Paper text:
AC2aCel5A is an endo-acting cellulase that is encoded within the first reported cellulolytic PUL, originating from an uncultured Bacteroidetes phylotype. The enzyme displays the typical (β/α)8 barrel structure associated with the GH5 family. The six closest structural homologues, which include all the biochemically characterized members of subfamily GH5_4, were identified using the Dali server and were used to produce a structure-based multiple sequence alignment using the PROMALS3D server. This allowed identification of the conserved catalytic residues, i.e. Glu172 and Glu303, acting as the catalytic acid and nucleophile/base, respectively.
The structure of AC2aCel5A was solved to 1.8 Å, and contained two molecules in the asymmetric unit. The final model comprised residues 9–397; no electron density was observed for the nine N-terminal residues nor for the final eight C-terminal residues, including the His6-tag. A surface projection shows the narrow groove stretching across the enzyme, with the active-site located in its center. This is primarily caused by the loop region between β3 and α3’ (red surface), which protrudes into the substrate-binding cleft and which is extended in AC2aCel5A, compared to the examined homologues (residues 115–126). Nonetheless, AC2aCel5A is unique in that it has an exceptionally narrow active site cleft, due to an extended loop region that seems well adapted to (only) acting on less-substituted β-glucans. AC2aCel5A contains a tryptophan “clamp” in its putative +1 and +2 subsites, analogous to what has been observed in other glycoside hydrolases acting on insoluble polysaccharides. Furthermore, in both the apo- and the complex structure, extra electron density was also observed close to, and between Trp178 and Trp254 in the substrate-binding cleft of both chain A and B.
Numbering used by the authors: 9 to 397
Write the structure that this text describes.
């Protein structure tokens, strides 16, 4: 069976992981700074905390903007690359699989504290082939440098080519009516990144590389992503993100989820989420192509009864992922609030739990990891909590 191959095994080995979010990706006025959005800098204790909790992987999103020299060499500032290098190796010391990327360089929405500085510009590339050529040259120079730094680091280190590429309308815009022009350029960008990584030598030759589809949307991925042509077989993984359904998990307009919820996104619950996973399973996993959620999550709630629904969500979706051989990394931005943007469960400098974060972390990891054939999606379903409305 292709789903039993070495690649899918590797994907599964990431298990449930954790994002060091709003950290090396944080930026304003055109430059990234680790502490720029209010997290303290990560330490060895951070990564020790993750491994102790049972996370198998860690994603370290990195925004490069502000640390990139002028064309044509686009030289990366050594101090910045040093810190990325250091974090990667702290994570490795803790026994974690590690993903690094190009992150808010390609932020494509209007609401950015770095207006005008996002060089990785999809609409600009679609409007002009000469702009597309320039962006591709920068991508090549950047990934070449990154790969050259990490040429002696093996397959525990994963490169993810890009983050969430879009035109600002989050997949509901012109991408659905431009004759696939945006999807095509994104596909070209992923090819260029893979080419660069493979050209960087040494262990970049057989490194796993994660590639995403449009705005990391699973369906637009399944429907339009073209896996780049590679110099070796079975070393690409499909990266996706899910905060579905958004008005439960992300905006928290609704604070219950699933078949026992009353304050729910209308008609969007377990079946919908499983359907999305099924599409990924059939398109990729079933064919021996691994899939991982680079980001998933749902915000924290103020009420205990509401919080039980969040834990239910994690148990259910993470079980569904395991059953489909899909790994997933929880989005942690360090924010301890309830509601919108409230994703912090582990302190980014100390590795300790934030508030009641242990209960969330346990829900996700222990559901994915469970190896009892009597622990099933049905058993989680039947144990769903009681509405408080």
């Amino acid at each position: 069976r292709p789903m039993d191959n070495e690649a899918v095994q590797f994907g599964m080995s990431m298990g449930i992981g954790w994002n060091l979010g709003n950290q090396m990706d944080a930026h304003y006025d055109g430059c990234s700074y680790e502490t720029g959005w209010g997290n303290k800098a990560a330490t060895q204790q951070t990564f020790n905390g993750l491994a102790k909790a049972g996370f198998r992987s860690v994603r370290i999103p990195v925004t490069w903007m502000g640390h990139i020299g002028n064309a044509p060499t686009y030289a990366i500032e050594r101090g910045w690359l040093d810190r990325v290098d250091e974090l990667v190796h702290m994570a490795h010391k803790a026994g974690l699989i590690v993903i690094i990327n190009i992150h808010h360089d390609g932020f494509g929405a209007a609401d950015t504290p770095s207006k005008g500085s996002h060089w990785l510009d999809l609409p600009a590339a679609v409007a002009s082939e000469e702009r597309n050529q320039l962006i591709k040259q920068e991508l090549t120079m950047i990934w070449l440098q990154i790969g050259k730094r990490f040429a002696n680091d093996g397959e525990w280190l994963v490169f993810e080519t890009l983050n969430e590429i879009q035109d600002g309308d989050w997949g509901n815009g012109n991408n659905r009516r431009d004759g696939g022009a945006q999807y095509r350029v994104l596909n070209e960008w992923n090819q260029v990144c893979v080419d660069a990584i493979r050209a960087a030598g040494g262990k970049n030759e057989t490194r796993y590389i994660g590639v995403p589809g449009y705005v990391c949307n699973p369906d637009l991925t399944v429907e339009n992503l073209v896996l780049p042509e590679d110099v070796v077989p079975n070393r690409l993984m499909v990266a996706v993100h899910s905060y579905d359904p958004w008005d439960y998990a992300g905006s928290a307009k609704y604070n219950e989820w699933g078949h026992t919820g009353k304050d729910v996104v209308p008609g969007v619950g377990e079946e919908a989420y499983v359907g999305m996973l099924n599409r990924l399973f059939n398109m990729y996993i079933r064919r021996g192509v691994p899939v991982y959620f680079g980001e998933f999550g749902a915000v924290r709630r103020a009420s205990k009864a509401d919080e039980e629904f969040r834990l239910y969500y994690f148990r259910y979706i993470c079980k569904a992922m395991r059953d489909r051989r899909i790994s997933a990394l929880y989005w942690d931005n360090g924010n301890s609030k309830a509601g919108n943007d409230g994703f912090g469960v582990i302190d980014h400098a100390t590795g300790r739990f934030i508030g009641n974060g242990e209960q969330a972390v346990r829900a996700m990891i222990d559901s994915w990891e469970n190896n009892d054939p009597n622990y099933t999606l049905q058993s989680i379903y039947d144990s769903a909590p009681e509405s408080s409305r």
